[PDB]
Amino acid sequence: NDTLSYANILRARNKFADALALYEAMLEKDSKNVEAHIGKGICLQTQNKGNLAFDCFSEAIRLDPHNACALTHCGILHKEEGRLVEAAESYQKALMADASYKPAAECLAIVLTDLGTSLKLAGNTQEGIQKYYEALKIDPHYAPAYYNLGVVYSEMMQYDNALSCYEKAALERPMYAEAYCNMGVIYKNRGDLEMAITCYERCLAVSPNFEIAKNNMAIALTDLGTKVKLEGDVTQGVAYYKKALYYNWHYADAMYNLGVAYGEMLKFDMAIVFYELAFHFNPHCAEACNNLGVLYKDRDNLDKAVECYQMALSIKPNFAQSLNNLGVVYTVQGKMDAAASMIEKAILANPTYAEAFNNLGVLYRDAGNITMAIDAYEECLKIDPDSRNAGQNRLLAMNYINEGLDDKLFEAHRDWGWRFTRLHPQYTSWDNLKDPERPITIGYISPDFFTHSVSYFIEAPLTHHDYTKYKVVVYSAVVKADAKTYRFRDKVLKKGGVWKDIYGIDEKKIASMVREDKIDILVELTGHTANNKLGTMACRPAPVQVTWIGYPNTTGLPTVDYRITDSLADPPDTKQKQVEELVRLPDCFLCYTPSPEAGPVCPTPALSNGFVTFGSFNNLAKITPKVLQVWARILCAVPNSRLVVKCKPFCCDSIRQRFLTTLEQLGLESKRVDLLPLILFNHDHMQAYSLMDISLDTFPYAGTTTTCESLYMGVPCVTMAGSVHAHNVGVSLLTKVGLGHLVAKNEDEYVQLSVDLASDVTALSKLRMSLRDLMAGSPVCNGPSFAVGLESAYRNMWKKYCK
Amino acid sequence: NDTLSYANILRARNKFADALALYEAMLEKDSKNVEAHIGKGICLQTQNKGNLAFDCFSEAIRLDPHNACALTHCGILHKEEGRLVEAAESYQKALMADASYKPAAECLAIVLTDLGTSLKLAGNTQEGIQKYYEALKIDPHYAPAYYNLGVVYSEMMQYDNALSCYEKAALERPMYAEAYCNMGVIYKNRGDLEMAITCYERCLAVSPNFEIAKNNMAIALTDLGTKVKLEGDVTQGVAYYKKALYYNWHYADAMYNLGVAYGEMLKFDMAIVFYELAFHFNPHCAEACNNLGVLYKDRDNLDKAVECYQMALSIKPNFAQSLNNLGVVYTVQGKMDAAASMIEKAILANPTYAEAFNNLGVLYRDAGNITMAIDAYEECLKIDPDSRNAGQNRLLAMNYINEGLDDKLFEAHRDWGWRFTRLHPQYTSWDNLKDPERPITIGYISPDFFTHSVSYFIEAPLTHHDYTKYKVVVYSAVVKADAKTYRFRDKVLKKGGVWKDIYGIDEKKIASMVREDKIDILVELTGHTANNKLGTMACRPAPVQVTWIGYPNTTGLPTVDYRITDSLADPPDTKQKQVEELVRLPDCFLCYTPSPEAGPVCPTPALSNGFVTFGSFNNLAKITPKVLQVWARILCAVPNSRLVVKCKPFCCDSIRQRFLTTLEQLGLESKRVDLLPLILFNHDHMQAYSLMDISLDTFPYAGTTTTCESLYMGVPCVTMAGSVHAHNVGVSLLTKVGLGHLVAKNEDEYVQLSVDLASDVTALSKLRMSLRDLMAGSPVCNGPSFAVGLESAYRNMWKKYCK
């Protein structure tokens, strides 16, 4: 008995060779020793001598058929070769011999699970399920059987059974990472993400390098961060995206969403970096390219923005947003035909993209197609009735061709103001001490303090302003400053005014700023044009609100008290109703300050070139078909005449061709018309007036700055009187320069005046050489008289408010 | 005269065909019209009819040889074909005709610069330079000539001339981006980075898509961020790295340095992400892999850390830091031979890497090579005399083989404490009200509150503590908690103690925490072992400072007042000097709390196996060669005996083989010794005591917890008395269990006692079955008596401090 026990101890100490030799020496003495046969079989198994182990166990079973141990080891040997059926039978025999032999029960549950899996992969799922239940009847603890049951239930969309099976599997084996992973995947599939996250956390606590769980954790965390961001907590969303990038460092979607979140935070450099990284890891992320193009466009890197949009469209050709943004950039670049084609494709891709309709209307307005622009604006308001940009661009466009014949323009503006007031709260009390004989704070607010038409007039008061009585505050919304902006700032400061840069600010806070500065009269210089601050004007921050030159009609805002004009642009008997009270200055409402780059007046080209040249440097939006027909009538009335028209959209060949067609259809030879694009130079723009002899003013929207520049170069400008301020601005200037005999009341006398002026080249030449001195001695250049008049008007308005 | 002028106007209007036809009709009338010849030549040039233009200009020159215009256009035609010499000659002729003809001068400066460039590329740099100076004599404004001059000067390392040339080039052309770029590159090369940055900013303002300037801006910004970080402002450095990543989104070095900066900020998730991204964009960034491995190691992801270090070493095989870190990880993994090889390679790569020497000493200590460990520690102190870890590991290692024979161990500890006090400030005043008969606040501070040897003793007071008089505060520095930590917390809280988790905190702030809690007696349980808080003890936060079990010798800190012991471990006449005052408890200084997993005592294996089994479960560091020789003497003295030794390092085959060699050299058959590695189970570790009959205690470092566990399983433990506490701990336990007849004073009686115990298997078996009851009735398990004794000692110490 000591030898068998010693051999068993040796076997248990992995000293298989000496124990084997002892079992051999015992079997030489007793070939019927079943236990020695079992020990021999086990020791041969450990030497990978399967056949001889099988022989030893077969002989043991022959000696003791009810040896559950020998039958179990025979089943194990059968199992290792994958011959599962005989092994299963052997285990069944072992249980019949000793139903308490736990190792046989456990191994039988294993092999029964393998059998069930084999049938499952063969599509025999239901009988496999029954054998898995048999396994759990044999060993209610074999967790892998629960895992397999959960997988099967998850394949038949029976998620509740799958969860119950995975929960049982995790109970029997707490470190069964795959069960937690599959639970997390199912819970993610059910919409609940916190549970899924918890399951993945359990998986990674059990298996920290299980990649599938890391990837799914990053996905679930990104979805959760997106939800939480949509719920308002953007910072916690960002935290979730960063934690997601911890498990999946290349998850491009988390980078894209970080880009978006940082964009909303105004951390544009990070938004750019993250969007570009998202594109690097996911090149099919056309949204990243689109948003990157947007950020580059707002950084004024238009070429990069174009590249980004072209990439987005090469990935998603129908990506309506990229189409619209590319159209907008081409509009900025002046590629009008490409802009049109892009915007039209965006509209085709999404007929409810209101902003695309607004941009189309803007493009048509710039192209002079006022009617189509209005139609597009009407479609936009049909889609977005609160589209502020569409409404204001609509009003502006209607100002170019709406001749005073009814109360529709006024109605539209008035209604516009009513709606905004019902949608924009304002103040009702002011702490400004009501003293009529004290200093007054004047705010001038405008986005165009650079080389713009408005600047050529606001320069006059800025230069001629009695600072000892009227403290000046400037609210510059300029997008891009320049030498003229700096000159204005220096002029205001050198006297004692206040300059505030307000580009990129809110509106209500600007109204607060106006209140802290105790502005008494706030003067808006923009009206319904781009980047206006009419919302600040709606807040009523100042006790007196004025408009003056940015818009040639009523603002329609009931909160604006007064509009400054004179008795020539708006005669006392004008029938055009306006929301503002008209205050008429005694002289011209305009004071032109010439550019110090105007250069000399040249002699009249007609003396040297032998031809009369009419011209117009107005935008195409002012060149209405009526004006086109009138100019054709003039040029037919003046034998051998030439017309020079310079407009930015003539950079596009299609626009030139269409304009030529229009003219030719009126009987005018295209060879007689020279269409020049914009030349980006103040000096050269002014010198271009040497190319024309007679300026033709536009109607019903006259020139304003263009007429003044024309006159400064000695080019007579024929205008027409009419029923709207925009028409009579030319009347005011020509009359105050002393050319009131050149203001027509209608088209026929306008033709007659143009032919008469063209008929006396000598009178034309003397006028050319006299016009600079005539204007410089006139009120249009009399800065001091204009300043005293404006100052008096301001004082009068203050007095009106005081009572 | 009107026809020529009209043709010139037509040419100026790009109506080249009609003007050409008019010039032809004029030349039919006057073939000598030089101006008509020039106009024809120009119009043919615009149709790319070079040969016919050349004919027209040649005839013009024949008609007017001094026509500077015709000569200039001939030079232009020559220039377009690249036949620069004749063109230059033609321009020289034009200047001789009319030295004021500016277009000829400008074009001549251009062609002279091209000639200079041609000579430069041919290596004829100096004559090219003279022609560039000729160009500047012709046109002092031709900026490209200045640029070329700057390039040439930059090629001859004449940087001041290069800067002057580039500055002149930028003056003549403000939008010459390349000049600013080259200036920035030179300034970067001179060390000044702000100027370079300014130049690149100018370049990108002129050319926002010039890639070279973006890349160089990112480089310069990364260098500047690195400097500023090294200057203390890490946040501004991070801002610079982010701005760098704005211009170069894939600059891997900025990502690596961001990883480092965020690591110093403790934003490890970001440090990981950035280091991995840096590796993605620069796979040769072995430093990123190293630091990523460090972060994964500190996140307990040892397999990933190993992968990262293997990657770093595949990139940089001699990267000493990665070698050291991989060695440390293998030490944690127990791969002792791989750790040794790695640390030795790190030492070979950098012989001044003190930390590598410390880690080598730690490895040798774990391998039991105390002498080599001490040598390595001495080398580390030679390199880093303030290396806290090396000094403490040295003292600990010396405790294993330094037998009390001189005052060197005490001297080393005492000096250690002196130096730290001179390098660690502490407090001198306490607000604790000096009342000897009031409640006392006891702090227990320790990192090992988990399943560790120390826990088996600290459990006793935590269970048996009168909370109504001694408020308990626990400072747990546990790195990884467990069920025993939670059990201790629950036990302390259920009574009214305070539990504070302090893992990962500073030392001085802990001293502040001890002061706010008004701790009266702070008890350190760690001494010079890993992660101790001896620096907190140096701060003297509590009025009374005690050590008790973490270290078997003096701490050497003069700020520690008392060490708790008894009269058996440190007899009253002990000659070992210590900095602490010894307070001897009346009973055993140890109270073992058995594990509730100890299971039953088995019968003595000798009755069933037929062999006597000696054993030892002590670490190899305690198994000194002297002990090895003694055990060999015992086993030779006991015929047919077996030794079982279980130690963790026996997982390494080389350590087993070397140990076997040692034994065999002493005449012991290796077959008689079973070396078992660590089994990671408390139950199975305790049940392993069924494999041995007699425990052999180690010297001069006795077992402590191992001896108690042995006794609880009924295994007698023979110990020896000696001159040091660590030796006499076994004496204390055996005497207090009632086995004082088994405490030897020397090796010969130790052998005699071991043979006598082995000779009576029957007495051995009765002892085995009695030992549990003997100890349970003994003071070692008498929690109440031990608690009253400790409580009395605490009260006495408080009273001593009160006076």
Specify whether the CB–CB gap between B708 and B780 falls below 8 A: yes
Measured from the Cβ of residue A82, the count of other Cβ atoms closer than 10 Å reads: 9
Which residue in A115, A113, A94, A112 sits closest to A103, CA to CA? A94
Dig out the tokens for A2 from the structure.
């000591």
- The tokens describing B274, both together, are 């950035």
Domain end position, chosen among B556, B585, B614: B585
The answer to whether residue B301 neighbours chain A at the CB level (below 8 Å) is: yes
Is B658 at the interface with chain A, CB within 8 A?
no
Stretch 195-214 of chain B: residues touching chain A, C-beta under 8 Å: 208-209
C-alpha distance from B701 to closest chain A C-alpha (Å): 31
Chain B: closest CA distance from residue A268 (Å): 10
B307 touches chain A (CB under 8 A): no
Does residue B747 belong to any structural domain of this protein? yes
Identity of the residue numbered B198 = T
DSSP three-state, residue A257? helix
Q: Strand (E) positions, B397-478?
A: 440-446, 470-476
CATH number, domain containing residue B17: 1.25.40.10
- B20 located within any domain: yes
From chain B, the residues in CB contact with A610 under 8 A are 2, 6
Query: In chain B, how many domains are there?
Result: 3
Chain centroid offset of residue A350 CA: 16
Biggest distance spanned by C-alpha atoms of chain A: 149
Q: Does B397 touch chain A (CB under 8 A)?
A: no
Residue A247 Cα, gap to closest chain B Cα (Å): 9
User: Is residue A631 located within the same domain as residue A565?
Assistant: no
Dihedral sign, CA of A352, A358, A363, A368? positive
Residue B769 has, within 13 A of its CA and on its CB side, a CA count of 8
- H/E segment holding residue B10: helix B2-12
- Cα angle vertex A298, ends A292, A300, to 5°? 105
Residue B279, CA distances (Å) to B312, B315, B329, B393 in order: 10, 11, 22, 36
Looking at the fold, whether A612 and A760 belong to one and the same domain comes out as: yes
**Interface probe with A: pick from B4, B238, B249, B672, most Cβ of A within 10 Å:** B249
Residues of B in contact with A608 (CB under 8 A): 5
Q: Are residues A560 and A651 in the same domain?
A: no
Burial (CB count <10 Å: 0-12, 13-18, 19+), residue A295 = buried
Q: Where are the alpha helices (DSSP H) in A582-681?
A: 605-609, 625-637, 653-665
For B221, list phi and psi in degrees, rounded to 5: -65, -35
Cis bond before residue A603 (omega within 30° of 0): no
Residues B536 and B618 in one domain: no
CB contact under 8 A, A9 and B609: yes
- Same domain? B624 vs B759: yes
Q: Is B615 helix (H, G, I), strand (E, B) or coil?
A: strand
Q: What tokens were used for B587?
A: 């009973």
- Chain B residues with CB-CB distance to A13 below 8 A: 674
Counted across chains A and B, CB pairs separated by less than 8 A come out at 42
Contacts of B274 (CB under 8 A, 6+ apart): B255, B256, B258, B259, B262
Contact (CB, 8 A) for A404 and A377 = no
Q: Are A203 and A103 part of one and the same domain?
A: no
Closest residue of chain A to B243, computed from CA coordinates: A269
For helices B252-265 and B211-231, the axis angle rounded to 10 degrees is 20
Name chain B contacts of A247, Cβ cutoff 8 Å: none
Query: Residues of B with CB below 8 A from A277's CB?
Result: 249
A651 & A571 share domain? no
Distance from CA of B504 to the nearest CA of A (A): 21
Beta strands A521-524; A440-446: pairing state: parallel
How far apart (Å, rounded) are the C-alpha atoms in residues A180 and A585? 83
Cβ atoms within 10 Å, residue A426: 13
Of B375, B376, B367, the C-alpha closest to B346 is: B376
Q: Is A173 left (phi over 0), alpha (psi -120 to 50) or beta?
A: beta
Q: How far is the C-alpha of A589 from the C-alpha of A571, rounded, in Å?
A: 12
Q: Do A462 and A521 share a structural domain?
A: yes
Q: Show the domain range for B737.
A: 605-781
Alpha-carbon distance of B288 to B309, in angstroms, equals: 10
User: Do residue B269 and residue A610 have CB atoms under 8 angstroms apart?
Assistant: no
Which helix (H) or strand (E) is A646 found in, with range? strand A641-646
Tokens at B301, concatenated? 């992801």
Which residue bears the tokens 């305690």?
A: B622
Cα distance between residue B522 and residue A437, in whole Å: 81
Rounded distance between C-alpha atoms, residue A261 and residue A234, angstroms:
7
* Residue B382 near residue B358 (C-beta atoms within 8 A): no
Say how far apart CA B666 and CA B659 lie, in whole Å: 11
* Tokens (6 digits) for B422: 């001179």
CATH code of the domain containing A683: 3.40.50.2000
Q: Are B715 and B694 in contact (CB under 8 A)?
A: yes
3-state secondary structure A177-200: HHHHHHHHHHHHHCCCHHHHHHHH
- B303 contacts A249? CB cut-off 8 A: no
Instruction: Let me know if residue A631 belongs to a domain.
Output: yes
Q: How many CA atoms, within 13 angstroms, populate the side-chain half-sphere of residue B398?
A: 22
Gap between the Cα atoms of B607 and B693, Å rounded: 10
Task: Please tell me which of the candidates B9, B242, B303 has its beta carbon nearest to residue A209.
Answer: B303
Task: Name residues 574-613 of chain A within 8 A of B (Cβ).
Answer: 608-610
Closest CA to B608 of B743, B466, B768, B744: B768
Are the Cβ atoms of B269 and A243 closer than 8 angstroms? yes
The alpha-carbon radius of gyration of chain B (Å, integer) is 45
Q: Considering Cα of A590, then A595, then A600, then A605, what sign does the dihedral take? A: negative
Q: Is residue A609 part of a domain?
A: yes
Three-class secondary structure of residue A616 per DSSP? strand
Q: Which of B269, B276, B301 sits opposite A242 (nearest CB)?
A: B269
DSSP B674: E
- The whole-angstrom separation of Cα B185 and Cα B148 is 16
**Of residues B5, B242, B608, nearest to A269 (C-beta):** B242
In DSSP terms, A696 is beta-bridged to A718
**Exposed / middle / buried, residue B702 (Cβ in 10 Å: 0-12, 13-18, 19+):** buried
Coil vs helix vs strand at B681: coil
Residue type, B399: N
H helices present in A384-479, as ranges: 388-401, 408-422, 455-463
Shortest Cα distance, chain B CAs vs residue A6, angstroms:
8
Residue B417 lies in a domain: no
* CA B556 vs CA B412, B640, B729: distances in Å: 8, 47, 20
Nearest residue to B642 via CA among B674, B689, B618, B602: B674
Experimental method: cryo-EM
Q: Does B276 reach chain A within 8 Å, measured CB to CB?
A: yes
User: Is the Cβ of A243 closer than 8 Å to some Cβ of chain B?
Assistant: yes
Q: Which of A13, A208, A249 sits opposite B276 (nearest CB)?
A: A249
Q: Is B445 helix (H, G, I), strand (E, B) or coil?
A: strand
CB neighbour list of residue A713: distance below 8 Å, 6 or more residues apart: A598, A601, A602, A686, A689, A690, A771
Using CB atoms within 10 Å of the CB of residue A574, give its burial: 0 to 12 exposed, 13 to 18 middle, 19+ buried. Answer: middle
End-to-end CA distance of chain B: 128
Angle at which helices A388-401 and A370-383 pack, to 10 degrees?
A: 150
- B301–A272 CB contact, under 8 Å: no
Is residue A752 domain-shared with residue A617, that is, in the same domain?
Answer: yes
Distance of CA A681 to the CA centre of its chain: 32
Residues of chain B with Cβ-Cβ distance to A274 below 8 Å are: none
Q: How far apart are CA A565 and CA A543, in angstroms?
A: 20
Burial class of residue B665 (count of CB atoms within 10 Å of its CB; 0-12, 13-18, 19+): exposed
**Residue where a domain stops, chosen among A517, A551, A585:** A585
CB atoms within 10 A of CB B66: 12
A166 located within any domain: no
Q: Which residue of B has its CA nearest to A245?
A: B273
CA distance B278 to B262: 14
Q: Are residues B548 and B686 in the same domain?
A: no
Q: Which residues pair with A471 in a beta bridge?
A: A441
Token representation of residue A110 = 């294993």
Are the C-beta atoms of A43 and A23 separated by less than 8 Å? yes
E strand segments, A453-547:
470-476, 498-501, 521-524, 544-547
Nearest Cα neighbor of A790 from A499, A583, A511, A492 is A583
> In one letter, which amino acid is A129?
I
Sequence-ordered list of residues with C-beta below 8 angstroms from that of A571, at least 6 positions apart, any chain: A728
What is the CATH number for B489?
3.40.50.11380
Beta bridge partners of B442: B472, B521
Regarding whether A776 and A631 lie in a shared domain, the answer is yes
* Residue A168 forms part of a structural domain: no
CB atoms inside a 10 Å sphere around CB B372: 16
Instruction: Tell me the residue ranges of DSSP E strands in B486-619.
Output: 498-501, 521-524, 544-547, 562-566, 581-585, 612-616
Which residue, A155, A190, A209, sits at the end of a domain? A155
Residue type for position A278: A
Q: How far is B273 from chain A (nearest CA, A)?
A: 6
The answer to whether the beta carbons of residues B390 and B358 sit under 8 Å apart is: yes
How far apart CA B768 and CA B761 sit, in angstroms, is 10
- CA–CA gap between residue B258 and residue B254 (Å, rounded): 6
Strand order in the sheet with B581-585: B498-501, B470-476, B440-446, B521-524, B544-547, B562-566, B581-585
Nearest alpha carbon to residue A619 among A588, A589, A587, A649 = A649
Measured CA to CA in angstroms, residue A803 lies from A354, A435, A443, A798, B318 at distances of: 47, 10, 21, 9, 91
- Judge whether B217 is closer than 8 Å to chain A, CB to CB: no
∠ CA(B320), CA(B325), CA(B329), 5° rounding? 145
Q: A498, A473 in Cβ contact below 8 A? A: yes
Q: Cβ–Cβ of A246/B674 closer than 8 Å?
A: no
Give CA separation, A653 vs A285, A675, B474, in Å. 36, 10, 87
Residue carrying the six token digits 């239940």: A133
Considering the domain architecture, whether residues A758 and A656 belong to the same structural domain is answered as: yes
Assigned domain for A368 exists: no
Length of chain A: 803
Burial of A2: CB neighbours in 10 Å, binned 0-12, 13-18, 19+: exposed
CA torsion through residues B39, B40, B45, B50, sign = negative
